[PDB]
C-alpha cells in the first residue's frame, strides 16, 4: 500500500533516504533524511519511520561495501528516531542530544545508546556537525550542517509551506529560531526538509515566513 524507502543520491558522499508512512490527518507522509559517507563510513542522519525501513536502509549501504558508525536523530519524533531500538539492537551507536533522549525517556520511547550536549556538536570532525538552533517544530530539534558540500539537514524544521503538527511545536519560540538559522546558513547550497522538497537557501526565507505567519494566527 504505501510506496517503498527509497534512495538517491544527493551530492558526492551524501544520500537522501525517503520512507514513507500513514499518518491520521496528513494522509502518506515522505520523510526524508540522510546518509553520509565519511571514508568508507556511513552515517545516518535520522532514521525511517520504522524498523523495517531502518533495517533495508542499513542494509543496502552494508551490501555496497560501507559499515554504518552512527546515526543521528535531530529530533524526538517516531519519523527521526522509530529505527533507534532496531540499530541499538545491531550495536550501530545512535546519537541524540541530551533534551532529545530525555523527551524518548518521558514517552516511554527507546533512547539512543550516546547523547550530546551544547549548541553545536562534531558527530565527525569537520565532516557532520550538529546545531540547535532553539525551538521550533519541537523543543529540541536540531539540524545537521556538512561543511564540506554546504548542504543542511533541516529536519521537521524546515517548514516553507506550512509549519505541519504542532502538537509540540513553539510557535512563540519558532521565529526567532528560524530568524537565527536563516542568518547562520545563508550561504548553504542545498537545504533537506523533513517532509518537503529539497531546496536553496531560499528555503530558509520561505520557513521564517511561514513561522511568523504561524505565530500571527495563533493571536
Ligand atoms: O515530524 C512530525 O512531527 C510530523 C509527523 C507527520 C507529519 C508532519 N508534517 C506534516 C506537514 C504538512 C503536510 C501536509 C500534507 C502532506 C504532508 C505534509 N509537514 N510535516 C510532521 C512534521 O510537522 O514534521
Ligand atoms: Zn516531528
Ligand atoms: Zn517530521
Redesign the pocket.
Known sequence: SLPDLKIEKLDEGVYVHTSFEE?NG??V?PKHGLVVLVNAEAYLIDTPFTAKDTEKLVTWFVERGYKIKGSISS?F?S??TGGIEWLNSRSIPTYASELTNELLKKDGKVQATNSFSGVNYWLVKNKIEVFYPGPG?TPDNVVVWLPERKILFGG?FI?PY????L?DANIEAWPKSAKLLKSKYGKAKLVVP???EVGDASLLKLTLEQAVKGLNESK
Open positions: 499518518v496528513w494522509g507522509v529530533h519524533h519519523d527521526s517544530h521537521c517548514k506550512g509549519l505541519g503538527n502538537g523533513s517532509h518537503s
